[PDB]
Design a protein around this ligand. Structure first.
Ligand SMILES: CCCCCCCCCCCCCCCCCC(=O)OC[C@H](COP(=O)([O-])OCC(O)COP(=O)([O-])OC[C@@H](COC(=O)CCCCCCCCCCCCCCCCC)OC(=O)CCCCCCCCCCCCCCCCC)OC(=O)CCCCCCCCCCCCCCCCC
Ligand SMILES: CCCCCCCCCCCCCCCCCC(=O)OC[C@H](COP(=O)([O-])OCC(O)COP(=O)([O-])OC[C@@H](COC(=O)CCCCCCCCCCCCCCCCC)OC(=O)CCCCCCCCCCCCCCCCC)OC(=O)CCCCCCCCCCCCCCCCC
Ligand SMILES: CCCCCCCCCCCCCCCCCC(=O)OC[C@H](COP(=O)([O-])OCC(O)COP(=O)([O-])OC[C@@H](COC(=O)CCCCCCCCCCCCCCCCC)OC(=O)CCCCCCCCCCCCCCCCC)OC(=O)CCCCCCCCCCCCCCCCC
Ligand SMILES: CCCCCCCCCCCCCCCCCC(=O)OC[C@H](COP(=O)([O-])OCC(O)COP(=O)([O-])OC[C@@H](COC(=O)CCCCCCCCCCCCCCCCC)OC(=O)CCCCCCCCCCCCCCCCC)OC(=O)CCCCCCCCCCCCCCCCC
Ligand code: HEA
Ligand SMILES: CCCCCCCCCCCCCCCCCC(=O)OC[C@H](COP(=O)([O-])OCC[N+](C)(C)C)OC(=O)CCCCCCCCCCCCCCCCC
Ligand SMILES: CCCCCCCCCCCCCCCCCC(=O)OC[C@H](COP(=O)([O-])OCC[N+](C)(C)C)OC(=O)CCCCCCCCCCCCCCCCC
Ligand SMILES: CCCCCCCCCCCCCCCCCC(=O)OC[C@H](COP(=O)([O-])OCC[N+](C)(C)C)OC(=O)CCCCCCCCCCCCCCCCC
Ligand SMILES: [Cu+2]
Ligand SMILES: [Zn+2]
Ligand SMILES: [Zn+2]
Lengths: 122, 99, 49, 101, 53, 57, 229, 196, 55, 173, 133, 49, 89
């Protein structure tokens, strides 16, 4: 149903959220596709939480690293938060990536279920 | 290195609940396999350290390298050929979407 | 290099803006089963207004 | 190098040069001679009469590696496709040979 | 008919393109990039380029 | 195995072969394939006979 | 079912690996470690060595095909890849084609060295030169060539297209041309010499007599209607 | 890319380098390429075919007879064990072979057979910076290329093994002998220039 | 002749006979064994019947 | 200005320009049922010319990639010796040069007659590109309005009572 | 020509450096002779003698040989298992159930197989595991 | 972090593949489990080594 | 540096025995580089007294494109003439 091509606009955050909530709660979605979206939502949050927690744990140690512990406060804080920022970004990006990939798979399943893709037929 | 490797090995064994005797037998066999291959290669390196690496030996090992890679690419060539002209249902009624 | 080049600027902040449903501007010559797509587009626009 | 005039005259009188030098070193100038590296080649008794080096005449690691390959093939195939494992306790004295070894 | 026209034009282009393009192209081989006159850099066979040019 | 490994060094005129290690390897890996391919008439997963009361074990 | 069939498939994989090792070791020897005068003149080597090298090259060509076929069979058995299930794309005829592409060159690998054995024994006892060693070498080499275009005479009935079937039949019937050259050369090697009757010579005569029958019966098997029957 | 023979060439590498830099028949006969042996003359009584052996009492020699352009070989391949001591002839074609047992020496006799050997190719000598050419067209014609140059400023001096060991463990003696050999090389070059 | 003198290996690959004249008695510094399969596996040589069958 | 101005695969400087990629994308939003036999013939001719062209495009990019790959290696010409690095850098760069070539619009008479035709076939093609390929139609309409083409489907239509379906790029009035 | 000025070491053996042109030393202690300059190459001789004899073929790495415990374990196991394979496949195929044990382990996703028990303990334990995904 | 923590969590703590696992594979989307692969656990010695 | 093998082997004072008395083997004097023929055909006939070394050289290897262009003009004009004659007839 979506336009296809290089010039086409990539899926925005609002479009992704709308399509996710459509797949979760609509009446025209079969139980398998809705279960796919639900399982996507269930497993994804752990990745963001774990990324944030691991970044917080590492940056607590990295704040006292042999060179970092002997730097002026501003540079010490920036270098210490660099692991936290990287790990938090990794967790959030991985959570969003997993959730959106399985949601897009569910969207493809919905489209094929209702025959809304040309050049796709049984 | 030993800490990480042994912890990973024990974690995988624990999560898969493998039969210890059978897996230890299989892993001993595979360890002997790999160890003796690598030991032969180490023998070659150590003996070619001095007084053994002539032009004939060098050309022999270059030929060995090219022959091994030609052997490896031989079966891969057949698999790639099969992949190119892969079998499919007739285009008329069975599989009209493969176009 | 040295002539007119079409601009690639496009609307970037309106959801499903380029999910264009058929009308008199599109001649109604789309894929036949896209009526469900048009209905979904209508519902999404009524949601986002 | 500078050759003494008396020595050169003595050499000219005693020996008359009649044939040219086939060595290419005659063309070398002093800069090329001074820019040369001296390398050493130890000359000892020769026993290997082939362009290939001496080859070890026993492959014990190879023999045992092939024995292990045979064991792997037979045991793994029987355990996978037949699900059969050899009952080593049937020949307990062979197993005891293994233990006592 | 098209073949006859094409081969007439091909011979004519061999006549024309040479002195306009190829012969001046030879002027690019008188010397090398560094300015030293052209010499022989072999690939594998050290051919005896004994003749003049 | 036999005739090639015996005659190629003779007829071609080579000291042993190019890979004596590979020659030994081939010979000592032959027996496993022989055993696997020759005893399928004695072996099958249904190893028990028709009068073996499988209901006892 | 799971068992002997899988054993056979993986044992064929292992046999292909062993054949790879064998022909690698043997062919690198003649190309690299040959004596200075017999690097490329194959007409000077004994006919058993010429035949062995030809069969090693043939095995080098067909071992990857056989390995691919058996690997596909194993995948179909244990992964349900449906390589030979017609319902969704596969075809068993592909498996037959692969195996017989390996198949006939294997039998030609098996038979040719015995030609070397007889071509060595007969001149030795007859203390005379063989009839035509060059022509026999070229006959076995063209037989090896034709071995890669006659693999389909084992698949006459499986329903191959008539174009392919006729190609297989016409290239198979012409393999009688090289073999008769071998027979004539052996017969002419037996004549006009000082015969020294040994025990290997009688085995050579038995081999010739046996090869006369099997060859013409196999040629009869290329008759399409007879092969159908 | 050329081996520093002062520290690395001991027995086989050392003998190969000696063959390369001297063309001494014995050494050369050890490392002659198996691909080709120089086409010698037909063996007669007055001009026997010389078969070289590097201090080995015998050698397997095959004979095919009077080679022709029509067919490359004259008669069938016949092998025999050519032994040291006297002229021995293939009776199939009456070809006389002489087994010359080359000795590890620099006698003029050894220099007599200097023209019966291919010069030792140095393309494969030393380490190579290319494993093998992945070219279907150049596999049988070209050796591996090199990104580096081959120096030509090396002068080789044979040294007795024990002395060579003292070269490796006594750097002062090594420098002394190297300086003396450089002086001798200067003297030799000056003498050659004077002769010219 | 130029191919044989300058690129002997390639010359051998072509089945070319050593073209250097050695009537003076000194053998050439780089000769080779003949490789005549190309000129033997022909419709004009000993491999005539085999090449006819392949043709 | 070649002598073969009649050729359908040929084109002048100001013909309608479509980059190969776009052309292929255009093939994904059309059906042969809706097209007349003349439109089908146009599309078949375009397919023939386009398959030959896409075959030939990497070759055109070879000298540019060959030069760029050499300049990445350095200022040394190790012909037959620097082949490994040269061809690795080529396997990298030649895709980029072909990317630029394939994303570069090229004029063609088939392009200018398939899109800009008064008949129902051209109207159908324009409407399908407008609805199913919004960005492709956006840039194509920007190109067409500068070539004195006036169609109801163009976003740059000043005589239309219906609002445009897409953003209108800046242009001279 | 710049001569080595002087050597300040009390070791009188090092005084040889003062007798040569620095470039000369540069030629025979650096560049080509860098891995040999001013060093007693005893280790070269030791390694050459190590590599030219007929020593223990079992090598672990460059520095060390394979451990004797590992070598002997491998050899004993190989010989005994090869003997077992030969004897069982040539003599003891008459009654498979007497000479072979049926054993099997499968994926934890599937239910535990009937033959997934510790052999030699069928009379004491019956083994099962909870499935996983 | 990169070689142990990241692979562990995306291999054993989820069944959803990441984009780089299948973006070039023309397979339908599917999940993967650690407990239906490599019955003969040759991956354990490989990973440990 | 020799072109003719016989010359190379007539009076060779670089033979190892001589070099054995100084023990200085220059890398620049490898026999592989000592002799190389002229890549032009050289064959021996029987002269009035002894062998005569006749040289066969058929064509030069220093031809430049301009020469190639000057001799190709008649061929190109012949092609043009024949094509136009076919068109007229
Ligand atoms: C591709 C890659 C493929 C890889 C291979 C894949 C397939 C893997 C198959 C695994 C099972 C194969 C098999 O039959 O193994 C035999 C068998 C497998 O166990 P099982 O299936 O329970 O035994 C039933 C068999 O029929 C054995 O019958 P049994 O009841 O006679 O077995 C008892 C016998 C088993 O004896 C053996 O298996 C001999 C080998 C012992 C090796 C000991 C190594 C010790 C040092 C390790 C470091 O003795 C012992 O267990 C004590 C041996 C003391 C020495 O191996 C063992 O029991 C050895 C375990 C370790 C013992 C350590 C003792 C100290
Ligand atoms: C099957 C035909 C169609 C294939 C289409 C493939 C399309 C996808 C290509 C994917 C790979 C792209 C390139 C990968 C990175 C660069 C690899 C590389 O260094 O290649 C140069 C490399 C040559 O480097 P070299 O061996 O040091 O140079 C030898 C001579 O100095 C100089 O030797 P030469 O001047 O006589 O030419 C040798 C070489 C020159 O290299 C090329 O032509 C490069 C392009 C082809 C690379 C192989 C593509 C895949 C073939 C399967 O050309 C070939 O081997 C013919 C192909 O050639 C190969 O790697 C070819 C491998 C396959 C050869 C046997 C099959 C033919
Ligand atoms: C998109 C593609 C990738 C773009 C990004 C990388 C561009 C690298 C450019 C480069 O390195 O320029 C050298 C240039 C310096 O010039 P140069 O090294 O003094 O000039 C090289 C030679 O001396 C003077 O140049 P040359 O004489 O060596 O150039 C020879 C080249 C001349 O042609 C070209 O250079 C063509 C490409 C021009 C652009 O000739 C050919 O291409 C003749 C081809 C012959 C075979 C034709 C067969 C078919 C006949 C019909 O800039 C750099 O070195 C900067 C490197 C920057 C690296 C990438 C930075 C990040 C990019 C993102
Ligand atoms: C049919 C034959 C057509 C004529 C071929 C050349 C005839 C000849 O006598 O050449 C002398 C010449 C002998 O060496 P040389 O160039 O005199 O030596 C100077 C350097 O040492 C040469 O060293 P190098 O490193 O410059 O190497 C030459 C360079 C030369 O480059 C080529 O040969 C490239 C050939 C393909 C070019 C692309 C197709 C044609 C495109 C035409 C339309 C675009 C025009 C430009 C558009 C605008 C660009 C801004 O080739 C390569 O680097 C690799 C060539 C192997 C194939 C690679 C893949 C193609 O022959 C060659 O270099 C071989 C040319 C092979 C051409 C066909 C290759 C396969 C094409 C598929
Ligand atoms: C080494 C083994 C070997 C050799 C040499 C051959 C040689 C030949 N074989 Fe084959 N063949 C097999 C092994 C061999 N074969 C096997 C194992 C199978 C079955 C595989 C399977 O299905 O299980 C098979 C199957 C087989 C078939 C399939 C039969 C069928 O399944 O329908 C055919 C038919 O085309 C055939 C033909 C030939 C031909 C035409 C030759 C020719 O090469 C032979 C020609 C030789 C001669 C012609 C020389 C004889 C000389 C004469 C002068 C005879 C004249 C003399 C008198 C009449 C007295 N073979
Ligand atoms: C049996 C196979 C069982 C299943 C395992 C599959 C993988 C087998 C790998 C075998 C590697 C080569 C043999 C063992 C190593 C060895 O002998 O090294 C010393 C030998 C060298 O020993 P050498 O005896 O030649 O010594 C050199 C010294 N001179 C020159 C004086 C003789 O190394 C090789 O032979 C290396 C080249 C191997 C060529 C290819 C062999 C097969 C490769 C795999 C085929 C495909 C497998 C499936 C994919
Ligand atoms: C906190 C650590 C920050 C590390 C930044 C440098 C590495 C960036 C790449 C990366 O993380 O790859 C992960 C990936 C694994 O994660 P992945 O499979 O999700 O891949 C990430 C990349 N994408 C998603 C685009 C495919 O690769 C590896 O972990 C490879 C093994 C380790 C390689 C060396 C890692 C350490 C190097 C830097 C040390 C100093 C810091
Ligand atoms: C000749 C060419 C043959 C090609 C096909 C060969 C057979 C297929 C094959 O190999 O399957 C694999 C086989 C598959 O066997 P399998 O039993 O898992 O089969 C999967 C399919 N089912 C479950 C449906 C039956 O083995 C493996 O996958 C084991 C892999 C172990 C090695 C892992 C290496 C990890 C490296 C990274 C570690 C971390 C770094 C940080
Ligand atoms: Cu057959
Ligand atoms: Zn003779
Ligand atoms: Zn070459």
């Amino acid at each position: 149903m979506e336009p296809f091509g290089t010039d086409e606009r990539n899926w925005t955050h609002e479009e992704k959220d709308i399509i996710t909530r459509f797949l979760k709660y609509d009446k025209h979605v079969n139980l398998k596709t809705a279960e796919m979206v639900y399982s996507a939502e269930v497993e994804s949050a752990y990745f963001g939480k774990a990324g944030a927690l691991a970044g917080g744990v590492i940056s607590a140690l990295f704040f006292n690293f042999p060179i970092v512990r002997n730097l002026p406060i501003i540079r010490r804080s920036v270098i210490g938060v660099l692991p936290f920022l990287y790990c938090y970004t990794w967790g959030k990006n991985t959570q969003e990536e997993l959730r959106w990939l399985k949601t897009f798979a569910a969207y493809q399943r919905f489209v094929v279920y209702h025959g809304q893709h040309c050049k796709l037929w049984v | 290195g030993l800490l990480l490797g042994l912890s990973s090995i024990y974690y995988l064994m624990y999560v898969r609940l493998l039969p210890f005797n059978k897996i230890i037998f299989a892993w001993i066999l595979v360890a002997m396999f790999l160890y003796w291959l690598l030991s032969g290669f180490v023998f070659f390196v150590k003996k070619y350290q001095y007084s053994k690496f002539t032009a004939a030996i060098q050309r022999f090992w270059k030929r060995t390298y090219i022959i091994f890679w030609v052997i490896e690419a031989g079966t891969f060539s057949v698999f790639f050929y099969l992949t190119l002209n892969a079998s499919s249902e007739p285009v008329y009624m069975y599989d009209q979407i493969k176009i | 290099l040295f002539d007119f080049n079409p601009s690639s600027i496009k609307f970037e902040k309106y959801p499903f803006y380029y999910w264009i449903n058929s009308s008199q501007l599109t001649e109604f010559n789309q894929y036949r089963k896209f009526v469900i797509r048009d209905s979904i587009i209508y519902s999404l626009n009524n949601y986002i207004i | 190098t500078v050759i003494n005039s008396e020595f050169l005259t003595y050499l000219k009188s005693n020996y008359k040069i009649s044939f040219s030098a086939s060595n290419i070193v005659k063309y070398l100038s002093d800069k090329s001679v001074n820019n040369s590296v001296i390398l050493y080649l130890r000359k000892n008794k020769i026993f290997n009469k082939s362009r290939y080096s001496r080859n070890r005449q026993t492959y014990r690691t190879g023999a045992y590696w092939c024995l292990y390959v045979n064991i792997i093939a037979v045991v793994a195939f029987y355990f996978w496709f037949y699900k059969f494992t050899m009952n080593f306790g049937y020949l307990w004295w062979l197993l005891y040979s293994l233990i006592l070894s | 008919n098209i073949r006859a026209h094409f081969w007439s034009n091909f011979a004519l282009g061999l006549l024309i393109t040479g002195p306009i393009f190829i012969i001046p192209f030879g002027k690019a081989f008188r010397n090398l990039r560094s300015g030293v006159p052209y010499y022989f850099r072999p690939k594998y066979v050290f051919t005896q380029k004994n003749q003049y040019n | 195995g036999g005739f090639a490994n015996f005659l190629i060094p003779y007829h071609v005129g080579s000291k042993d072969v190019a890979y004596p290690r590979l020659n030994s390897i081939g010979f000592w890996i032959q027996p496993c394939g022989y055993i696997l391919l020759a005893k399928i008439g004695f072996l099958r997963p249904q190893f028990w006979r028709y009068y073996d009361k499988t209901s006892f074990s | 079912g799971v068992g002997s069939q899988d054993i056979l498939i993986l044992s064929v994989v292992f046999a292909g690996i062993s054949t790879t090792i064998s022909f690698t070791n043997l062919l690198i020897t003649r190309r690299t470690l040959a004596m200075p005068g017999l690097r490329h003149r194959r007409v000077l080597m004994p006919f058993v060595t010429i035949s062995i090298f030809l069969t090693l090259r043939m095995l080098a060509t067909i071992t990857p095909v056989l390995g691919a076929a058996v690997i596909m069979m194993a995948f179909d058995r244990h992964w349900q890849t449906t390589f030979f299930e017609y319902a969704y794309g596969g075809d068993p005829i592909l498996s037959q084609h692969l195996f017989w592409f390996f198949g006939h060159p294997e039998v030609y690998v098996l038979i040719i060295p015995t030609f070397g054995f007889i071509n060595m024994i007969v001149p030795h006892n007859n203390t005379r030169r063989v009839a035509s060693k060059h022509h026999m070498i070229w006959a076995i080499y063209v037989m090896a060539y034709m071995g890669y275009l006659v693999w389909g005479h084992h698949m006459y009935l499986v329903g191959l297209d008539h174009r392919s079937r006729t190609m297989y039949s016409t290239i198979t019937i012409m393999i009688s041309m090289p073999a008769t050259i071998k027979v004539v050369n052996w017969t002419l090697s037996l004549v006009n010499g000082a015969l020294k009757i040994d025990l290997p010579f009688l085995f050579s005569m038995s081999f010739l007599l046996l090869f006369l029958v099997a060859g013409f019966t196999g040629m009869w098997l290329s008759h399409v209607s007879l092969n159908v029957s | 890319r050329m081996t520093n023979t002062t520290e690395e060439a001991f027995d086989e590498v050392s003998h190969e380098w000696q063959a390369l830099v001297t063309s001494n028949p014995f050494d050369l006969n050890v490392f002659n390429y198996l691909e080709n042996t120089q086409t010698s003359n037909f063996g007669t009584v007055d001009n026997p075919l010389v078969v070289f052996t590097s201090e080995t009492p015998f050698r397997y020699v095959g004979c095919t007879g009077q080679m022709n352009e029509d067919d490359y070989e004259g008669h069938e391949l016949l092998f025999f064990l050519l032994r040291e001591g006297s002229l021995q002839r293939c009776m199939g074609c009456g070809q006389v072979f002489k087994l010359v047992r080359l000795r590890n020496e620099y006698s003029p006799e050894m220099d007599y057979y200097l023209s019966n050997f291919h010069p030792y190719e140095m393309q494969e000598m030393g380490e190579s910076d290319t494993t093998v050419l992945m070219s279907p067209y150049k596999y049988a014609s070209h050796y591996e290329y090199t990104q580096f140059e081959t120096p030509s400023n090396m002068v080789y001096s044979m040294v007795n093994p024990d002395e060579h060991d003292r070269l490796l463990v006594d750097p002062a003696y090594r420098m002394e002998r190297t300086k003396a050999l450089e002086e001798k090389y200067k003297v030799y070059t000056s003498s050659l220039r004077e002769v010219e | 002749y130029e191919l044989f003198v300058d690129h002997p290996d390639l010359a051998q690959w072509t089945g070319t006979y050593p073209k250097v004249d050695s009537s003076h008695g000194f053998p050439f510094y780089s000769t080779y064994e003949m490789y005549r399969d190309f000129q033997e596996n022909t419709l004009n040589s000993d491999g005539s019947f085999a090449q006819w069958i392949t043709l | 200005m070649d002598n073969n101005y009649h050729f359908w695969g040929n084109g002048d400087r100001q013909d309608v320009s479509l980059s190969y990629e776009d052309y292929y994308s255009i093939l994904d939003c059309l059906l042969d049922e809706k097209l007349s036999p003349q439109g089908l013939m146009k599309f078949k001719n375009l397919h023939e010319v386009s398959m030959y062209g896409v075959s030939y495009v990497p070759l055109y990019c070879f000298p540019v990639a060959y030069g760029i790959s050499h300049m990445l290696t350095g200022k040394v010409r190790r012909g037959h010796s620097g082949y490994r690095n040269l061809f690795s850098l080529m396997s990298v760069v030649l895709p980029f040069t072909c990317w630029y070539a394939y994303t570069t619009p090229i004029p063609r008479r088939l392009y200018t007659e398939i899109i800009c035709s008064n008949n129902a076939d051209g109207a159908y093609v324009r409407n399908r590109i407008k609805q199913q390929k919004p960005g492709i139609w956006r840039k194509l309409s920007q190109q067409l309005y500068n070539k004195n083409f006036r169609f109801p489907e163009l976003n740059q239509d000043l005589t239309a009572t219906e609002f445009p379906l897409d953003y209108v790029a800046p242009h001279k009035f | 020509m710049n001569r080595f000025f002087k050597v300040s070491s009390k070791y009188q053996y090092y005084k040889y450096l003062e007798q040569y042109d620095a470039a000369f030393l540069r030629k025979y202690q650096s560049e080509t002779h860098w891995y040999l300059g001013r060093r007693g190459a005893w280790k070269n001789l030791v390694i050459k003698y190590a590599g030219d004899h007929i020593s223990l073929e079992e090598e672990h790495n460059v520095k060390y040989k394979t451990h004797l415990s590992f070598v002997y374990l491998s050899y004993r196991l190989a010989w005994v298992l090869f003997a077992y394979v030969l004897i069982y496949n040539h003599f003891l195929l008459g009654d498979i159930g007497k000479t072979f044990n049926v054993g099997e382990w499968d994926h934890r996703l599937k239910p535990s197989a009937e033959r997934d028990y510790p052999t030699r303990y069928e009379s004491l334990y019956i083994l099962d595991r909870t499935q996983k995904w | 972090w990169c070689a142990y923590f990241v692979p562990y969590n995306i291999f054993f703590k989820t069944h959803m593949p990441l984009e780089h696992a299948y973006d070039n594979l023309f397979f339908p989307y599917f999940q993967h489990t650690h407990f239906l692969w490599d019955n003969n656990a040759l991956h354990i010695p490989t990973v440990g080594g | 540096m020799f072109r003719w093998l016989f010359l190379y082997w007539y009076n060779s004072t670089d033979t190892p025995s001589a070099i054995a008395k100084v023990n200085l083997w220059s890398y620049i004097n490898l026999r592989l580089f000592k002799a190389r023929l002229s890549s032009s055909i050289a064959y021996y006939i029987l002269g009035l007294n002894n062998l005569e070394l006749k040289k066969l050289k058929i064509f030069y290897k220093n031809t430049y494109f301009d020469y190639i262009y000057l001799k190709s003009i008649p061929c190109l004009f012949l092609i043009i003439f024949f094509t136009n004659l076919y068109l007229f007839l």
